[PDB]
């Protein structure tokens, strides 16, 4: 019944050729970025005062050691796979690993690898498995990887043990920032002419946190099913932005409103009526 | 291969009031591969000391970035976001409009 924040650890490793390469990483707890990992750096940087959770300094340091060795070894393995399998540069690899905790001391995890922007393999249970639409050569690579007991045990226990203990330390240490509520502000605007006799009404909503929001154009309590909400766009201070438009004939605009619902308003919706 | 062209969205943090201080945002998203060149422009000239988010990616693996700078809107100043990518024949510019 308490809120659920999954931890997803992202990695971007790029290989322009046999010599030039860089690997960068970051980690997210729900919508918040807790960590950053730059190729120029030797450590994973913590972005929030509570990023280390309830981990000891020595526990955080052995993780820093695993990531140091993993980054070096990831790079050398890619270069050696490309030479053996005759792959063509440039190569781009992405990893998406992490877990989410549940009530009942259960937990599910994932570790997905992508090549040129498409899934090729993942870690399932105890070993590596290829995806259905994985190129033929990926099967030669899975074979070599699954011979590496040490790495398989290490990935297994990172996902099934380390990751869930870590996120639970983040959930209490960052309890307060995760429950924080920031009220949005909304304003009205007119957009470029959609048609000859038509108007584009624009509703701007900015500065809300957390991410879940509800914004629709209304005529009283009848929702206007023609509302086009955009993407939820980020602000530099980690609140969000939304623009919600409606195409209507000139005369029907009168009597329409833009309604905003958000956890921060405690039922007190923002309702702005058309000029 | 399958390369994805970037989507560019330009917006301000607060309702633009001429002469008041504001933040100018450019969210660049849905592109692949990751190498990208993003600039914010003041009357076609590049702005310096502009900050950006750590490069990240969505479930479908396309990348996204947020570039932003503090700025003061006026009646005649034109702001834009200029992006170049492998998928683009020329650098693409998206002007800012308070709508």
């Amino acid at each position, epitope marked *: 019944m308490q809120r659920l924040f999954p931890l997803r650890c992202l990695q971007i490793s790029s290989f322009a050729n046999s010599s030039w390469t860089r690997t960068d990483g970051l980690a997210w707890l729900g919508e918040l970025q807790t960590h950053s990992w730059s190729n120029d750096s030797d450590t994973v940087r913590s972005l929030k005062p509570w990023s280390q959770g309830t981990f000891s300094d020595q526990q955080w340091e052995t993780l820093q050691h695993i990531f140091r060795v993993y980054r070096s070894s990831f790079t050398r393995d890619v270069k050696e796979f490309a030479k053996m*399998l005759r*792959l063509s540069y440039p190569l781009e690899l992405q990893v998406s690993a992490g877990c989410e905790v549940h009530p009942g001391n259960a937990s599910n995890n994932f570790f997905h690898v992508a*090549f*040129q922007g498409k899934d090729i393999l993942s870690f399932q249970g105890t070993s590596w498995e*290829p995806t259905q639409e994985a*190129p*033929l*050569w990926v*099967n*030669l690579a899975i074979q070599v990887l699954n011979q590496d007991k040490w790495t398989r045990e290490t990935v297994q226990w990172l996902l099934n043990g380390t990751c869930p203990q870590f996120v639970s330390g983040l959930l209490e240490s960052g309890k307060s920032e995760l429950k924080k509520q920031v009220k949005p502000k909304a304003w009205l605007s007119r957009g470029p002419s959609p048609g000859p006799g038509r108007l584009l009404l624009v509703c701007h909503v900015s500065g809300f946190y957390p991410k879940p929001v509800w914004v629709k154009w209304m005529r009283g309590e009848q929702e206007q099913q023609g509302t086009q909400p955009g993407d939820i766009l980020p602000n530099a201070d980690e609140t969000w932005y939304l623009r919600a438009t409606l195409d209507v004939v000139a005369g029907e605009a009168a009597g329409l409103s833009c309604r905003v619902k958000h956890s921060s308003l405690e039922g007190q919706d923002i309702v702005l009526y058309w000029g | 291969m399958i390369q994805r062209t970037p989507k560019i969205q330009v917006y301000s943090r607060h309702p633009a009031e001429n002469g008041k201080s504001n933040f100018l945002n450019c969210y660049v998203s849905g592109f692949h591969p990751s190498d990208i060149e993003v600039d914010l422009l003041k009357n076609g000239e590049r702005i310096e000391k502009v900050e950006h988010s750590d490069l990240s990616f969505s479930k479908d693996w396309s990348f996204y970035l947020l570039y932003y700078t503090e700025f003061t809107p006026t009646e005649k100043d034109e702001y834009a976001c200029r992006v170049n990518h492998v998928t683009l024949s020329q650098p693409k510019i998206v002007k800012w409009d308070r709508d």
Partner: nanobody
Amino acid sequence: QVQLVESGGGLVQAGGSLRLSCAASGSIFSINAMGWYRQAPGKQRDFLAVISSSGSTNYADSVKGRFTISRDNAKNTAYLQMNSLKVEDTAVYYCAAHVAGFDEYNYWGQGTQVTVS
């Protein structure tokens, strides 16, 4: 161009053997890895076996032990010797190649039918 042509399919009794072949056209340098998939009626195409120019192989667990993949680099052709066939092996068997310069997708053959009665 790349051209993969299969042969060796047919119809055989349960317990029998069959040997499929795949002739590729191009250099020995332009084909990197060769392999086999199969698709039963109304199901997905499943990976079966792969072999590199150096001779390294990988087999899917369903067939590990019954099928063996082989390669003749002089004629740039791959073989799949199928032994101890079961009825569940009835499918279209497709040839696949990893062609130099194309790492994101396979090159495919038109397939050859294998029916086991």
